[model samples]
Target: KRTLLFKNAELLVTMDDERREIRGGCLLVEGNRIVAVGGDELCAAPADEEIDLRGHIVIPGLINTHHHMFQSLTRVIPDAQDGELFDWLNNLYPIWAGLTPEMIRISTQTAMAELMLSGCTTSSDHLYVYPNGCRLDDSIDGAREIGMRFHACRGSMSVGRSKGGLPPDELVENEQAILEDSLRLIHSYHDAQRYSMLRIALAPCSPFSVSRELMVKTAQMAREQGVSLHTHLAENDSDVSYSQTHFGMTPAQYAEDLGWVGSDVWHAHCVKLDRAGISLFARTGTGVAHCPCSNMRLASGIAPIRAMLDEGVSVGLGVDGSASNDAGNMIAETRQAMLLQRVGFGPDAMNARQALEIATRGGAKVLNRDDIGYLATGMAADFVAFDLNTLNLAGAKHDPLAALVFCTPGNVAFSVINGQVVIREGVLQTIDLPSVVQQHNRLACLLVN
Candidate 1:
């Protein structure tokens, strides 16, 4: 089996159960799993390849629990720039309807490359709209080429404006077709093995964009296949208003009635969840994918992240969609999460270590995986290192682990996933990113023109 040894890290932060921080730490990997982690003691371990990571601060690779990778193609559209959630979607639905398979593939690569450079090794993408021959497989193929641990959510919008839904009629698909396609994708790509590089999750777009019948059927299908469930829920005031007007109940009540609360389910943008709803989610072991940047960009209220953490609700960080976040930088997203909570509550509301935990181990738990998001024996060999010698990190060397979250965020200097070096010396090793960007720009121009 392939073996590699990494030694001499300035500081290695292991986000394990004990939260160990080792000085001059070293690690060893065999195949796809970490075999050893210690401070200087394992430096002399035998291996097939060895690398010295001096002057670098190392930690578990960041994880993105929610995103819309396809939205990278339509970021910063002029008319859609200043509206709230529903208005923004109404303005952009026709534009998104022009998406082709080539656009989907190129956009997925673009978003993943951005996330990778920012220290993300695993990401979950919700690609809900499929127009002009785009399919979930397009996103899967793109993510595979980029060497990312990917969760491809087979997301659907089955209710159109004609049915008082948000998305246009053309963007919505038949419920039967959506379910069959979801099952087909799961059989083709979902892997239940530990340290699996790919998994499939069934996601219905949102409460306003999908029918109750589709939501129930999708949940049942996901449970039967032993997969996970994901969707948008209680994002803002408008979202709650629609739920009350249409369903005669709150978003939390509707979700519970449909069996969408558990460890196997994660809802995105719970910014408007109240105390009772939060308690329900905590009791049921349901997770929330908190998107701070998107919430602020859309003028959505701040999520009670501090309250959620205090209540023991599972919470993770997400970059959301590029159209809302305008960038897919995981490091910056984590920093923003910390800052937003401090603004909503106080400086003591959330700390750097807790924010880093949400971006790493918190995301792993949300996606229902046990083998990733930590640096420990028997865990997946996924970690990233940043050069503490960088200009922005100067004078912050006293606490490098905390500096990574508090100081100005920077690109990862080295990254490894599944025991493979996908990024080294701050350069991507999996695909030709320059060429991908060139093609992506060409397609993006065509779409907006």
Candidate 2:
């Protein structure tokens, strides 16, 4: 039996039942759940472990709904530079085929360490390829070693280039083997209980890399087994056009017809969703993961986000695959999501609070959860603290929440997950981050030239 208390925090934005803002607040955590969150007025003496955050602000830990953690080993392929989505994949497919289990292990650690330092306590990663002994276990092990919550989608691709898919034959798996391996991983790793540190979702790469039969079968199998579904959908004009040319259906229509549109499903990058498609998502309780930096990097147009928000769609942020965004820091991803909307819509189009909400609560909605995003009794005891005295917040101390979401998006003082301190004062405690990063850089360099 262990307990911890955070006492006299400067500000506590509970993102809870009342969305309370408490000044000089305290939080009591027992095991992996927040037991109390409010003023110290009703609290008892400190436990064996107590944190005094007198000069800091506390917010619920940010959740990343979509990522490709293993892709950290393959970013900015020279031939893929300045190209659109499908073309970029075409160029990088060969290079990605060179990944090994060791490289993936190092890269996953590197990405998670970066993400943990950026205040992302939980993340969902989509990894579809298994080349050179690389398997989903590499990422799963890395996330566990880092002590951060990981939502791993055992992603797969069946159709290769010869079969008219996006990847070369070397990177694509045989369909029977893919299904069998997915089931094996699911039975071996999936934990459906609330507050589980790792959960499994089924992802069938995308329309361009997976067959219509695979998508239909994957969705059916996922539902039959009580797991969620994820995939790329309507990511760009090219994606929409490809689906129509190949499957003779719009992305959303294709998803709906294939039993892939539901509350248990979320798609990455719906930048080109039509009004009807948006309505379909809103009506069906489907979720959208918006990867702003990757979309801009690939010149994929601005997603119809404002319109989707107006229609009550669940919208969350993603760092996307590191091969595209070139980074896996979700806090920076949050800043990009916030700032890009201001660039497209207006200054008031998005605020720091809204951005933080997307990273926290909105992401939980995308994962179809109510017990993980907020800071309240029975909620997951995941929170991040930023020092009010940091250089980035020097002039903006009066609004530290905004400062955290806007000014000093890159720095985090402390990151916690499930009542355990995983990062302290910008240093990782679970694993040797510098060594992992050093090894990761070595492997990443080999992929370059």
Candidate 3:
């Protein structure tokens, strides 16, 4: 029922092949696909809902390649707050056993709300732990209500502590049951059409939590189903040590040996992926999800992303889990990635647009999506707008685009996902976020105490 027209934008960063930045741009949307994109000429295009954007900076909505939506309710938990990767997980695993379907639904809404406020329109969530009847369906249903495009990675833990796995016995599932649920979710939810709003992927929990057999079987099943594979890999120093001691190979070597490296697979972290690993990913078309702020927060060493990009390895940005990052803010995470590259790679290592590209185009590549990550005719109408007159952006109008990342990262004035306005004037238009947050906190307190 909408022929939406957004006109007179001060700047529109079209991350197309040309990476064009239109100074006086306008965009026309027919339902969920972009119908036209250009200058004032687009204003004359047919539209029922017309909105003026005279002082706005618009770009393709940011994409998040990796996350743990269930982890949002545990943010800043005291025992895990100052710990590193392994210590953090060890402390939080037992607490997560308290999760229920209601908690999952509320936390998913809370995390997606935060992501949307920070300009993310599409996100991939790896909810690897299911306890007390919590299922991937909870997250998917929550995303539908929030109206953000979702890749609900059907995640599982199939090996327990008795089997030399990281998760407790009660929390681990039978491999057969895990596979059955994954197949069911795929059959029920995976949409393989253009401009799709939902998709499914097989995601086994990290190396120590899943057995070798499960990883291999999941990879094979994913290819047969035409979905993708996802997991955590070499997130920190200890993570590398675990791979070497347990598998007698480097993390990437272990992955390749298990038939896990390909265009259909994308691993989270890889902060310690070595020279050979980088070359392997580049050759095998394997992608990596770079979680800069989470890596920094957990002290999981800076990933060699500057090198990864140079070698033509596909790389996207992730906010990781809310418990690890303590915040699900896309623009802030992109800025952190930009500032991080400069530490060892010199001042010219990365720029604002390049980092923003990673969150948009780069995430699209990692997720194997071409219809998104750009603004153009026939593409999904997924984009966000930052008002130039916003407080942090006022003095930095000289380069408004750069200011989006350089200045204190803030919420978008508007966000349109699948041509549906989800946020307008810096307020979420989809769900009642305040109500979700209130419920989320009560449930979180119960799990923590």
Candidate 4:
């Protein structure tokens, strides 16, 4: 019943089917869907609210397909530094075991605020640990308050130290209890319809942390409920070694045998995937959440993203856990993804436009949501606009779009999610971020001292 119009944008980068880039464009959004898009002169301004986006380059709000909302509380832990994936987890598991409900809530809000400011309107968070009354509901509730589209994965760790797994027994839950909780969360929050405000996914942590039974059960449960599956796969050499030793197969083979392949599932950080494994993923339409920062932070090797993309695999950018990345900036991740490809390949490996597309369209494709990741008629009005006049892209005004990806990445001046203005002029309008930061710091310090 409401229509909002954006008038006079300097350029509109619509990651549509045709990849339209409209100059001096206008967009009309009615309710939660975009009704029209054209040059400013063609659109009629019959709206409840109309905003001028002059001198701003507008693009679909970025999508983050993988994150660890709870891990925001564990960022910059000195003892976990300079190590590979397994070593990093071994060093930090104790700290994560002490997480509280309050910490989960505040840290989720903090991460969401950072993501929103950086132009993410939709994100999927993997909160595997349920410690000290801190359930995945904390992240769900926190993201709702922050006003972003959320995919809250009911992540679990059912095998622990007592059972020769990665985490302590105290941190792992019983398989039956985990399944019951997972179903409850899905029934309560999952919206399977297109343009859904929220959804639920099943993530069984990682191969080393979860049992094969749990992984298969989760995959079956997800498919039965028509939801998606997610988990870490082949993140480092240790991850591959653990899979081979435990399952007598590569990570991809185990995943395929365990029903973890196909379009409905997306694995995170396949930095060690070999040619056959990559071929398996491409052949089956499996997705990968490529986290460059986390890979670098944990000394996990760079994912063969260029090869994956070339072979027609679905790849999306993820900030991973805040603890691993230390900063949940999707823009920075985009720039890193762009340059990392060139570092692995030649100068023509990747470009700014391709990077932007990955963060936008590629991510949407990974999430299996066609209504988002584009600014077109009938698409969800999820978009962000960066000020070209701002210091971030000031000198590169000649090519603002390129600057957005290549320059020292900066926060969006405006961010809108589901036709609602979540962030205005770089400030979150939905949550008091300073208060959230204060509460988060207090909880983190309590755990430390």
What lDDT does each candidate get?
0.92, 0.84, 0.91, 0.86
For model 4, what is the error of residue 292's alpha carbon versus the real structure, in angstroms, after optimal superposition? 0.6
Ranking by lDDT: 1, 3, 4, 2
For candidate 4, report its TM-score.
0.97
- TM-score of each model, in listed order: 0.98, 0.96, 0.98, 0.97
Worst 10 residues of 2 by lDDT: 39-48
What lDDT does candidate 3 reach at residue 391? 79
Q: What is the Cα-based TM-score of model 2?
A: 0.96
The candidate that achieves the highest lDDT relative to the unseen native structure: 1
Residue-by-residue lDDT tens digits, candidate 4, 1-449 = 88888888899888877878888888888888898888845456778988889999998999999999788877778777665556777878888889888788788899988888888999999998887788988888888898989988888898888888778887899999999999999999999887899999999888567777888888889889989999999988877887788779999998899989999989999999999999999999999999988888777877889899899999999999888888899888999998888887889888998888889888887787778888988899899999888776778977778898789857888888999988778888998888888888888888766
Model 2 clashing residue pairs (backbone): none
Position 209, candidate 1: lDDT: 72
The positional error of residue 366 in candidate 2, measured at the CA in angstroms, is: 0.8
Residues 1-449 of candidate 1: C-alpha lDDT, one tens digit per residue: 99998899999999988999988999999999999999756899989999889999889999999999988988999988985666788878888989999899889999999999998999999999999889999999899888999999999998887877777888999989999999999999999999999999999988567777888899999999999999999998988998899789899988998999999999999999989899999999999999999999888889999998899999989999999988899999998999999999998989999999999999999999989989999999999999999998999998998898789857899899998899989999999989999999899889888
